[PDB]
C-alpha cells in the first residue's frame, strides 16, 4: 500500500486484515522463518507486485493466518505452500513484529517509532 504512518508516527502493532486479489500470479513478497513455531515474517515486498498494490503489508509483519489457516506456528515450507495455494483471493491476518524480525537481518534494530533500521 501507499505510506500511511509517516515520520515518527508509531507503526500500529495490532493485527490487521489484508485482502489481496492476485488471480493466478505471485503475491509479490518474501517470507522468512526458522524452526516451526518461532514465526513466519515478511522480509521483502516487491515493487509493483500484488502485495504492494492490493495490500497493506510491510517488512517485519508476522503472518498470523492465511484464509483462516493459522500460520503462527507453521513450518517454513508449509507456510509457503499455504500462501502459494491460497487461491486468487488471499486474506492475510498480519501483525507488525519488528523486534523479532530484526534478529534475522545483519546490523538491524528497531528505532523509537518502531521502524526497522539497518546500519
Amino acid at each position: 500500500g501507499s505510506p500511511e504512518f509517516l515520520g515518527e508516527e508509531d507503526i500500529p502493532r495490532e493485527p490487521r486484515r489484508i485482502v489481496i486479489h492476485r488471480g493466478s500470479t505471485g503475491l509479490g513478497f518474501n517470507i522468512v522463518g526458522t524452526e516451526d513455531g518461532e514465526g513466519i515474517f515478511i522480509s521483502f515486498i516487491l515493487a509493483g507486485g500484488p502485495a504492494d498494490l492490493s495490500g497493506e503489508l510491510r517488512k517485519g509483519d508476522q503472518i498470523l493466518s492465511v484464509n483462516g489457516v493459522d500460520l503462527r506456528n507453521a513450518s517454513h515450507e508449509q507456510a509457503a505452500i499455504a500462501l502459494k495455494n491460497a487461491g486468487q483471493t488471499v486474506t492475510i491476518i498480519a501483525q507488525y513484529k519488528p523486534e523479532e524480525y530484526s534478529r534475522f537481518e545483519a546490523n538491524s534494530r528497531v528505532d523509537s517509532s518502531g521502524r526497522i533500521v539497518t546500519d
Binding site: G26, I31, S43, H76, E77, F104
Partner: peptide
C-alpha cells in the same frame, strides 16, 4: 541459522 527464505 536454520533460516529459510522463499518468494510467494
Amino acid at each position: 541459522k536454520n533460516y529459510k527464505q522463499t518468494s510467494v
